[PDB]
Amino acid sequence: PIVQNLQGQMVHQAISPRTLNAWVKVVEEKAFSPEVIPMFSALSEGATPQDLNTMLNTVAPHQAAAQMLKETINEEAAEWDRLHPVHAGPIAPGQMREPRGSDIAGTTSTLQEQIGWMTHNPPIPVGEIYKRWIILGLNKIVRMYSPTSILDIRQGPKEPFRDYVDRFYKTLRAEQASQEVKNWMTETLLVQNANPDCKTILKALGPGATLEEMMTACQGV
Amino acid sequence: PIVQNLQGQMVHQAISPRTLNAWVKVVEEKAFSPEVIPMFSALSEGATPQDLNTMLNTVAPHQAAAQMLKETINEEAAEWDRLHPVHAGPIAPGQMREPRGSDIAGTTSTLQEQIGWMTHNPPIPVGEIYKRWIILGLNKIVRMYSPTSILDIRQGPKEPFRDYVDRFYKTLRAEQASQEVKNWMTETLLVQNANPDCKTILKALGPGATLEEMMTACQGV
Ligand SMILES: O=P(O)(O)O[C@H]1[C@H](OP(=O)(O)O)[C@@H](OP(=O)(O)O)[C@H](OP(=O)(O)O)[C@@H](OP(=O)(O)O)[C@H]1OP(=O)(O)O
Helix, strand or coil: CEEECCCCCEEECCCCHHHHHHHHHHHHHCCCCCCHHHHHHHHCCCCCHHHHHHHHHCCCCCHHHHHHHHHHHHHHHHHHHHHCCCCCCCCCCCCCCCCCHHHHCCCCCCHHHHHHHHCCCCCCCHHHHHHHHHHHHHHHHHHHCCCCCHHHCCCCCCCCHHHHHHHHHHHHHHHCCCHHHHHHHHHHHHHHCCCHHHHHHHHHHCCCCCHHHHHHHCCCC | CEEECCCCCEEECCCCHHHHHHHHHHHHHCCCCCCHHHHHHHHCCCCCHHHHHHHHHCCCCCHHHHHHHHHHHHHHHHHHHHHCCCCCCCCCCCCCCCCCHHHHCCCCCCHHHHHHHHCCCCCCCHHHHHHHHHHHHHHHHHHHCCCCCHHHCCCCCCCCHHHHHHHHHHHHHHHCCCHHHHHHHHHHHHHHCCCHHHHHHHHHHCCCCCHHHHHHHCCCC
16 A cells, blocks of 8 residues: 655555455355455455465465466457557656556556656546456456356245345356346346245336335235 | 129129039028138128028028028018108119119119119129128027027136137127126126136136136146
């Protein structure tokens, strides 16, 4: 992250060891479940690209996930270079150069370059964009490691309706289908895969019932 | 039917043999089920009263049905004579006489008389009125031959709801109750005679639900 020194100048502060250890616990203990992404986003809050690569070292022992992340990051860097062609010409002395795809990812840049790029009015946030690339890679990894299809999430004969709903929506978060397909899933498949008593009540409830009304009508069933 | 010759004059064309054979198949194979009436109406499309009597010969071997048709036709002819008293007086040379009940049914008229009566501006359609009398007779015949009461149409334990609905409405078409009684039947008896699971859902659906909503809520039940 970025901190101000006693003289009012922006200084890079490394991630503290217990934050890094929290991220290591997330990576090594949670099997890339969907909650790895909110936790990563919280733990890399306000980070520089050099900090993000420190957090990416924890993924390297997981070769398939690390390779998927590398492919996503290379694709994003190439796309960034294509959409930001390197202008050839003079530059104002008070203006800094334009980082490349290998620079936003911190492969060839240095710490002061990233601090200066991020600390500006108006800012060009290099940490947030690299973070979004990482999150796309992690979404792909969560999709790859998902153990069940949404078609296989079915309410047990004695399972409470809220628990089935939580499992259903967690798998839906993992699968990341298209928006229209997701709407069809939540409207139709949730009712279709409920157990007989809840299914009877939900069918009687009619189409277009909100999830809150469905939870109300199935509370003790 | 009526066709125009090469000189532009209206000429009667007989019913083709395969149309008559289609009507014979309807009469001899369908046991006077309710669909005999739409089929008869389609097959006698644009017919003259002389054509209608050719189609009525097919019914003559069925003595009860033929007698019911004859009674209905005699009643309609008598009513037509009563509501159209034979005016005694001069008639315009450019105006034709008024057919009687025995003439619209083609018992005493001739082909040219019927062609001239039907081909006029404005027309006096003798084929359509005789056809409506025939249809009243056929409705009575369909009522007589109906095998089941509407009170006896009950959904089977595994019967799909759409099939029960189709049987119910077909019997209702056969029975031809009064309009208010029919509305009571479709609103109350259909729900009352459904099987337990569909009945539970329909009772939960509430009064005044449309048939489409009932079909939606019972699709796989
Ligand atoms: O309206 P319909 O009286 O039933 O007329 C049809 C129709 O003939 P037209 O349209 O020429 O009057 C058929 O023609 P398609 O368009 O089906 O071809 C024809 O069948 P063919 O094509 O075999 O000529 C058929 O004639 P057919 O009796 O030989 O089956 C004939 O029926 P009618 O002869 O009873 O008028």
